[PDB]
Amino acid sequence: SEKSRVAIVEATRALLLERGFDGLSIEAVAAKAGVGKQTIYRWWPSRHALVADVLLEDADKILARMPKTDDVTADLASWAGTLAAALTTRRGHAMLKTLMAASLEHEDTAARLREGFSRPLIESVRDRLRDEDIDADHAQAAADALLGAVVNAVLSEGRSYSRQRAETSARIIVAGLRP
Amino acid sequence: SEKSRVAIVEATRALLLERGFDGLSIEAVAAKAGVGKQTIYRWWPSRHALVADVLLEDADKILARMPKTDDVTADLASWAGTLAAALTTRRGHAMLKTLMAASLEHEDTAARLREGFSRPLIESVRDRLRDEDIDADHAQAAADALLGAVVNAVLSEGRSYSRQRAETSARIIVAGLRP
Numbered sequence: 263s264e265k266s267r268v269a270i271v272e273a274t275r276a277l278l279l280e281r282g283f284d285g286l287s288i289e290a291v292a293a294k295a296g297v298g299k300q301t302i303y304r305w306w307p308s309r310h311a312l313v314a315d316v317l318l319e320d321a322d323k324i325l326a327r328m329p330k331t332d333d334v335t336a337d338l339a340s341w342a343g344t345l346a347a348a349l350t351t352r353r354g355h356a357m358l359k360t361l362m363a364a365s366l367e368h369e370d371t372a373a374r375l376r377e378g379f380s381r382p383l384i385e386s387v388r389d390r391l392r393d394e395d396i397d398a399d400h401a402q403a404a405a406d407a408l409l410g411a412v413v414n415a416v417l418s419e420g421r422s423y424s425r426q427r428a429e430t431s432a433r434i435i436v437a438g439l440r441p
Numbered sequence: 442s443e444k445s446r447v448a449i450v451e452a453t454r455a456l457l458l459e460r461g462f463d464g465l466s467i468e469a470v471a472a473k474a475g476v477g478k479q480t481i482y483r484w485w486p487s488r489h490a491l492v493a494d495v496l497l498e499d500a501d502k503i504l505a506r507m508p509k510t511d512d513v514t515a516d517l518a519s520w521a522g523t524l525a526a527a528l529t530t531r532r533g534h535a536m537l538k539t540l541m542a543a544s545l546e547h548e549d550t551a552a553r554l555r556e557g558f559s560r561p562l563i564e565s566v567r568d569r570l571r572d573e574d575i576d577a578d579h580a581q582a583a584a585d586a587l588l589g590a591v592v593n594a595v596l597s598e599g600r601s602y603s604r605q606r607a608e609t610s611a612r613i614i615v616a617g618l619r620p
Contacts, residue, residue, distance in 0.1 A: 359545050362541065362545060362596070363542070363545045365596075366538050366541060366542045366545075366596075369599070372597075372599075376597050376598070380597050399609060400609065400613060402606065402609075403590070403606050403609035403610040403613055404610070404613055406590045406593070406594050406606060406610055407586040407587065407589065407590040407610040407613065407614060408586065409593060410586065410589035410590040410591070410592065410593035410594060410610075411582070411585045411586040411589040411590070412589070413589065413593045414585070414588060414589035414592045414593045415585050415589060417541070417544075417545075418551075418555050418559050419555070420548070420551075427581065427582050427585060430578060430579065430581075430582035431582040431583070431585055431586040431589075433617070434579060434582055434583055434586065434614060434617035434618060435586060435613060435614060435617055436617070437616070437617035437618075437619075438612070438613035438614055438615070438616035438617030438618075439613060439616075439617075440616075
């Protein structure tokens, strides 16, 4: 109808902060919303799409922030470690996997999720480096490598990836920007 | 039966080097093999799984190699640029997306594909750095960042990612390992 959609969105959101990601399939959502799964497909092509779409509604409060002190190495190491910690929690890791999964289903969905989740992280790192008069090309390349280190590692090896590897990758990258 | 499986594997493999990835759905495979899609599910849970499984059969000839000169910066920049080039071709990019997609479906599948595709790349970079007496922790962190830069960027922004950004990320990382 017009409220059936809302019920699915609300069922998904409640199921998220109650059973987490592991117990959040289309069936659970459909049963909690009270609808046939094809009613869900009137609005989302897939479970990943539906979950990512709800998470996207919240990108702001999901994405955290860059320390800003007189020590750029400490700032980026702190940032990278906090990110690594966040994405290796059980919830954080399942979230990353869900967002990547949804992204790979449609190029438009990937673009939407990149704008929501990846862009603020790249821009935070890039801006912090430009603050120190690093040029645009090196700031971009360094940001690709620091965010890339963390995201790729968590996607590849999962929750055993550590705050410590992330921080070490950050210190190496920043040292390579000297002066 | 026992040859129906072979026919699907052979249909997939031929369809790969004839129509590429964009024209390779379960339907095309089923029609070329002559089977019902549920016969395919006797052996693979999904289209991504089936495609990744065939690609995995070939990991060796898929994965390329590390230059070994007296210039570690040139070697890693060459390696990273070649990798970036390979993953931003139309076929290379669709392959990366398919492997990541399959990986996210089952933790065992991810582990199998990581062993097949990611491990040789990480180890190639790590080994090249240990060659220069970089310790194990920094060699790992630098490898995470160089491979991570490329893979994460191609997954996020697709085929517009360039050889040049990859090479710049490599030179920055290696410079951060001095001495």
